[PDB]
């Protein structure tokens with residue numbers, strides 16, 4: 393398997409969710425960015441794996457589950473069975489990552505993408521080693537009930553550019569946003 397990555401879109405007040413959905417109106421090109429970044433594998437013959445908590449799984453409309461072109465893994469401590477459509481169910485993040493080191497999965501999985509929610513991001517971001525954060529800065533406050541922790545810049549470096557990421561400010565529906573990539577190596 394390849395690198396470990398988080399991807400997230402965050403409002404100005406660090407919100408990521410509200411009532412089991414996103415806090416802002418649908419941003420078509422921001423979803424297309426999430427889709428492109430999580431689907432595109434750098435190695436031929438492999439797919440990427442997305443890891444998410446249970447509420448994040450059910451925040452994806454059923455018609456889009458599992459996320460196409462990606463191996464979908466759901467984290468849950470209490471589910472008796474994998475949610476219909478999921479490819480894998482793991483009881484902890486460590487269990488999920490050790491799944492990716494199985495030989496027959498490692499030769500089919502390139503990047504691992506953490507796609508939320510709050511507790512999954514937090515655990516991944518404190519795991520030592522190489523990690524990238526793909527962060528969309530939604531440049532407006534939105535009412536939220538689920539949040540992302542402020543990034544420690546002594547640990548995470550904001551990259552000046554990244555292949556395949558547009559650096560210019562974007563705007564949809566009167567909402568400005570910009571794509572950022574952070575990297576730590578501790």
Ligand SMILES: NC(=O)c1ccc[n+]([C@@H]2O[C@H](COP(=O)([O-])OP(=O)(O)OC[C@H]3O[C@@H](n4cnc5c(N)ncnc54)[C@H](OP(=O)(O)O)[C@@H]3O)[C@@H](O)[C@H]2O)c1
Nearest residue numbers: 400401409412413445446447448467468469470508509510
């Ligand atoms: N803006 C963004 O980029 C973004 C990204 C993701 C999500 N969201 C939004 O955020 C909200 C969902 O996130 P959330 O933080 O509320 O919930 P979440 O982390 O997706 O789901 C929490 C549940 O997942 C399971 N879980 C989480 N961490 C686990 C671990 N380490 N091991 C085993 N199981 C684990 C537990 O399920 P059990 O109770 O079954 O044990 C837990 O109750 C929604 O509003 C969604 O739309 C936004």
Ligand SMILES: Nc1nc(N)c2nc(CN(CO)c3ccc(C(=O)N[C@@H](CCC(=O)O)C(=O)O)cc3)cnc2n1
Nearest residue numbers: 399400401414423426427451452456459460507508528
């Ligand atoms: N930067 C960024 N932005 C976010 N919004 C985000 N959201 C999440 C979690 N949630 C909602 O909380 C999603 C809900 C739905 C989809 C979804 O349906 N995806 C399809 C459709 C693509 C299309 O519309 O064509 C696909 O990826 O194929 C994806 C994530 C995680 N990480 C994100 N990171």
